[PDB]
Amino acid sequence: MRVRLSKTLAGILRHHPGRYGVRLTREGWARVSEVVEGLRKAGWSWVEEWHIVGVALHDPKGRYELRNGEIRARYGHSIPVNVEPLPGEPPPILYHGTTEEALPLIMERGIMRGRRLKVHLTSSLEDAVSTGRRHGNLVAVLLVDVECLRRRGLKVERMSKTVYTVDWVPPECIAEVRRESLG
């Protein structure tokens, strides 16, 4: 964390900009120079703007967006911001990675947001597993019926090539559960 630049940047842009001296607009935008200065004040003496540009442009998932001198995270916020969705229709199945410990409550009342503003879904099975493992448990992957969501009046918004958001996933819209412990 304190050694991982992209992980630290995601935290600044999604959860806690103020303690790095970073101001965000209500669309999530930060000045890259202000991000670099905030990281340097926090002890990252070697960080330069070309690092932050590369964290964004070489990110494998499209976590970040640049615009002349500014940067934002496209999704994952716990800070209230508005990010406009990308064009594109979601595929019929999306994945959500979680823990086996969370399954009984998910089965009762669905997937609900944690600290983030929205529930996040991915078209990449690999990424769903990686995300579940961050919750540090036996990983469970939920296969989510996207048109079930839309039939329930939930908008499914594309925030990056592979990541989509929704307010809530009703338990009826969970098509399949795959448990790590049974692989």
Residues forming contacts to Cl ion in the complex (CB under 5 A) are 27, 75, 77, 82-84, 119-120
Q: Which is nearer to Cl ion, 42 or 102 (CB)?
A: 102
Q: Which is nearer to Cl ion, 51 or 124 (CB)?
A: 124
3-class DSSP state of 9: helix
CA distances from 170 to 32, 87, 91, 140, 167 (A): 38, 25, 18, 17, 10
The least CB distance from residue 40 to Cl ion, in Å, is: 27
Q: Which is nearer to Cl ion, 58 or 115 (CB)?
A: 115
Could you please report the per-residue DSSP string of 152-174?
TT---EE-SSSEEEES-B-GGGE
The least CB distance from residue 55 to Cl ion, in Å, is: 18
Q: Any idea what DSSP says for residue 96?
A: E
Q: Which is nearer to Cl ion, 47 or 169 (CB)?
A: 169
**Which phi and psi (to 5°) does residue 51 adopt?**
-65, -45
The least CB distance from residue 119 to Cl ion, in Å, is: 5
**In 3D, which of 130, 134, 139 has the Cα closest to residue 180?**
139
Q: What angle do CA 163, 71, 14 make, to 5 degrees?
A: 55
Q: Which is nearer to Cl ion, 24 or 52 (CB)?
A: 24
The least CB distance from residue 38 to Cl ion, in Å, is: 21
CB within 8 Å of 50: residues ≥ 6 apart: none
The least CB distance from residue 28 to Cl ion, in Å, is: 7
CA 156 – CA 89 distance, rounded (Å): 9
The least CB distance from residue 162 to Cl ion, in Å, is: 14
Identify residue 130 by its one-letter amino acid code: S
Q: Which is nearer to Cl ion, 41 or 69 (CB)?
A: 69
